[PDB]
Design an enzyme around this catalytic site. Structure first.
Site, PDB file in Angstrom:
ATOM      1  N   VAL A 172     -82.517 -23.305  26.099  1.00  0.00           N
ATOM      2  CA  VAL A 172     -82.380 -24.509  25.294  1.00  0.00           C
ATOM      3  C   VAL A 172     -83.152 -25.648  25.946  1.00  0.00           C
ATOM      4  CG1 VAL A 172     -80.763 -26.110  24.212  1.00  0.00           C
ATOM      5  CG2 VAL A 172     -80.087 -23.749  24.635  1.00  0.00           C
TER       6      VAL A 172
ATOM      7  N   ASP B 148     -65.418 -18.301  21.122  1.00  0.00           N
ATOM      8  CA  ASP B 148     -65.767 -18.456  22.525  1.00  0.00           C
ATOM      9  C   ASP B 148     -65.529 -19.888  22.956  1.00  0.00           C
ATOM     10  OD1 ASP B 148     -68.722 -17.706  24.581  1.00  0.00           O
ATOM     11  OD2 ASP B 148     -66.609 -17.364  24.938  1.00  0.00           O
TER      12      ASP B 148
HETATM   13  C1  XEZ Z   1     -75.927 -27.796  28.816  1.00  0.00           C
HETATM   14  C2  XEZ Z   1     -76.134 -27.807  27.512  1.00  0.00           C
HETATM   15  C3  XEZ Z   1     -76.315 -29.071  27.181  1.00  0.00           C
HETATM   16  C4  XEZ Z   1     -76.548 -29.539  25.903  1.00  0.00           C
HETATM   17  C5  XEZ Z   1     -76.713 -30.779  25.463  1.00  0.00           C
HETATM   18  N1  XEZ Z   1     -76.893 -30.742  24.141  1.00  0.00           N
HETATM   19  C6  XEZ Z   1     -76.841 -29.479  23.724  1.00  0.00           C
HETATM   20  C7  XEZ Z   1     -76.958 -28.873  22.481  1.00  0.00           C
HETATM   21  N2  XEZ Z   1     -76.857 -27.562  22.361  1.00  0.00           N
HETATM   22  C8  XEZ Z   1     -76.649 -26.774  23.424  1.00  0.00           C
HETATM   23  C9  XEZ Z   1     -76.551 -25.401  23.268  1.00  0.00           C
HETATM   24  C10 XEZ Z   1     -76.351 -24.516  24.226  1.00  0.00           C
HETATM   25  N3  XEZ Z   1     -76.322 -23.319  23.654  1.00  0.00           N
HETATM   26  N4  XEZ Z   1     -76.489 -23.439  22.440  1.00  0.00           N
HETATM   27  C11 XEZ Z   1     -76.638 -24.722  22.138  1.00  0.00           C
HETATM   28  C12 XEZ Z   1     -76.523 -27.318  24.688  1.00  0.00           C
HETATM   29  N5  XEZ Z   1     -76.623 -28.687  24.830  1.00  0.00           N
HETATM   30  N6  XEZ Z   1     -76.207 -29.794  28.282  1.00  0.00           N
HETATM   31  N7  XEZ Z   1     -75.982 -29.052  29.234  1.00  0.00           N
END
Ligand code: XEZ
Length: 249
Positions: free
Chosen positions: A12, A109
């Protein structure tokens, strides 16, 4: 239209718009992902990570960006967090979950890794890769697939061929509440073989993590962490709980 891939977040990445400077999260998956997009399309709630869209180049999902990061990072090990912040996050976790169950979706989850915080520290439920439909056409479908993370997972998922979806999420929310309150997870899995789980069943709350928890919150946890998913408290009733409705700070 043009997004700069500023940095990796989780894969991500954080994407900042070239003109707007707006921040969004881009989940990158090279070929479950068709269902994750379907489900995302149904969701609209201020306590759920907003879906913006997708592009099939390797698949790209456009998801709300949460500056706050995961709730996991707001929990101090062996300590937890101040009871009022926990309650606030729990109220938002409940609103998010109520919503999902209302449109017949189960996350499957729920853990602090999947509970993101925005700039205002508002909680958002995140990652629907394991989520599935448990009600359609007002018809409930029992679940049989084993999902989740073991410390968070409900006991029925382990011992039963089929189980109701909603009590499973309710259980994980209680484990989440426990983590926020005591800064630790009570057991490795909810099984009789596990010594810690047995102690809770026996009501030995003079042990950790329960010793670190005030009586009002603990009373709620006794209602949530009930082995029989049929006896377990439901969300509408969590809503009537005394600690749940206790003014704090
Ligand atoms: C770890 C994940 C994040 C974060 C901040 N914004 C998001 C948005 N989606 C995700 C995410 C993680 N897995 N699927 C979507 C993580 N994010 N920050 N730290």
């Amino acid at each position: 239209e043009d997004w700069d891939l500023v940095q990796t977040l989780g894969e991500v990445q954080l994407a900042v718009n070239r003109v707007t400077e707006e921040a969004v999260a881009v989940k990158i998956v090279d070929m479950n992902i068709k269902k994750e997009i379907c489900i995302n399309k149904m969701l609209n709630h201020e306590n759920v990570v907003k879906f913006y869209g997708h592009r099939r180049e390797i698949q790209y999902l456009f998801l709300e960006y949460c500056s706050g990061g995961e709730l996991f990072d707001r929990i101090e090990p062996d300590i937890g967090m101040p009871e009022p912040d926990a309650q606030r996050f729990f109220h938002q976790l409940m609103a998010g979950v109520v919503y999902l169950h209302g449109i017949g979706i189960t996350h499957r989850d729920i853990k602090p890794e999947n509970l993101l915080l925005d700039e205002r520290d508002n909680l958002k439920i995140s990652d629907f890769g394991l989520a599935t439909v448990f009600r359609y056409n007002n018809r409930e479908r029992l679940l049989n697939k084993m999902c989740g993370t073991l410390p968070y997972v409900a006991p029925e998922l382990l011992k039963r061929r089929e189980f109701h979806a909603e009590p499973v999420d309710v259980w994980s929310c209680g484990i989440v509440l426990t983590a926020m309150l005591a800064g630790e997870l009570p057991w490795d899995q909810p099984s009789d073989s596990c010594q810690e789980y047995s102690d809770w069943k026996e009501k030995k709350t003079y042990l950790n993590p329960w010793k670190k928890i005030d009586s009002a919150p603990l009373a709620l946890l006794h209602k949530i962490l009930v082995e029989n998913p049929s006896a377990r408290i439901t969300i509408p009733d969590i809503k009537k709980d005394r600690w749940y409705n206790k003014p704090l700070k």
